[PDB]
Amino acid sequence: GAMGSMERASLIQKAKLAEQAERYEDMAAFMKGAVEKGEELSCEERNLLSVAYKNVVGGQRAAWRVLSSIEQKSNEEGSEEKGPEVREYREKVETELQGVCDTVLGLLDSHLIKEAGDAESRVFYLKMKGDYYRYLAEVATGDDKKRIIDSARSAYQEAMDISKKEMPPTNPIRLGLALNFSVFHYEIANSPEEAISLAKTTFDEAMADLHTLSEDSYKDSTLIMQLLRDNLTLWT
């Protein structure tokens, strides 16, 4: 790895600098380097890794959607033939996106998940695994699409099972997992009723546990609860 000669602490320091500079590709490369040092990641470090790749892949997804929309319009009736370029360029962005997802999934598999024993780390990583398979599913159109979808579902489900056993219903990781698994159901698995049920139950169980929280924990939890409500409003 190109980061093999840099100290772990220096990689972390630079990831934080990259974040301040909105240099998310750099941030992701620094955090990949840090992961490849082989030590477990702290809570803060795990969130640097997730922020970095979320921003990188988020940009790719947004571009893919623009290009996919243009390509779809080109295959409508009465659309003039413009040649292979739209498809080629959509494929280029798609391949880059798939590469980033495979990189993240590779980090999780080698060896973040297997060393993650505490619920907060294990659920965090399994949520990421579900998320990055979900992004692969968004662009999948071939013979492996069902298997990609099932890989997302399996990771989310393992995360859900651990989170329900080991975390309070207001835990932000548990809430964010549920938010995203609900979106998986709606947007990927063609299961809007499951999506709505999950979001509602998650919201209601969190509401009932808010009384146990400090002011700062309350603020954190209610932010994600509002996202659940926002999705429910979109879907009903």
């Binding site: 964010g176 938010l179 979109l234 879907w235």
Partner: peptide, 5 residues
């Protein structure tokens, strides 16, 4: 598009 985190 729906909210994810």
């Amino acid at each position: 598009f729906p909210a994810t985190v």
